[PDB]
């Protein structure tokens, strides 16, 4: 008697389960991945940080690159928090770039729509570009946050 289970099969695939942002490599080196964070954890977390992703050539890093000598193990890191926004934290040996503009390392920056981060600057032939995608679904939850219905 699985009445509720039967309906669950109706959807099958649920997009935007708890996705924060998605990283898409436009330079063709790293496979598209999706960064995610749980809402309960966000509302529960209060240590000036909920969930942060680390990117680089390190297998530990939340993001694995194609192994670039210029890029560092953990070239860059992305943090999620605030009232309802995302932040980008650069953590490379040579620096992290935003649309051609180099930002201050280990510095928090406001997220941008379809933004892109460039890394491995120094040699025109040794730079890597990454694009960041934002899940509108996630914003909806944060925008509504507390739902007025149940007492």
């Amino acid at each position: 008697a699985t009445q509720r289970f039967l309906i669950e099969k109706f959807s099958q695939e649920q997009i935007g389960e708890n996705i924060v942002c998605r990283v898409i490599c436009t330079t063709g080196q790293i496979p598209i991945r999706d960064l995610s964070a749980d809402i309960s954890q966000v509302l529960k977390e209060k240590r000036s940080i909920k969930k942060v992703w680390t990117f680089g050539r390190n297998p530990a890093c939340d993001y694995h690159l194609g192994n670039i000598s210029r890029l560092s193990n953990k070239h860059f890191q992305i943090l999620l928090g605030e009232d309802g926004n995302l932040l980008l934290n650069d953590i490379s040996t040579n620096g992290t770039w935003l649309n051609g503009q180099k930002v201050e390392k280990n510095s928090n920056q406001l997220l941008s729509q379809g933004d892109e981060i460039t890394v491995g600057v120094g040699v025109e032939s040794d730079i890597l570009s990454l694009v960041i995608f934002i899940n509108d679904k996630f914003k909806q939850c944060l925008e509504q946050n507390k739902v007025d219905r149940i007492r």
Partner: peptide
């Protein structure tokens, strides 16, 4: 630290 991964640094400060 300096050993692995190429790095840069300007000599003007």
């Amino acid at each position: 630290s300096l050993e692995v991964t190429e790095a840069d640094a300007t000599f003007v400060q």
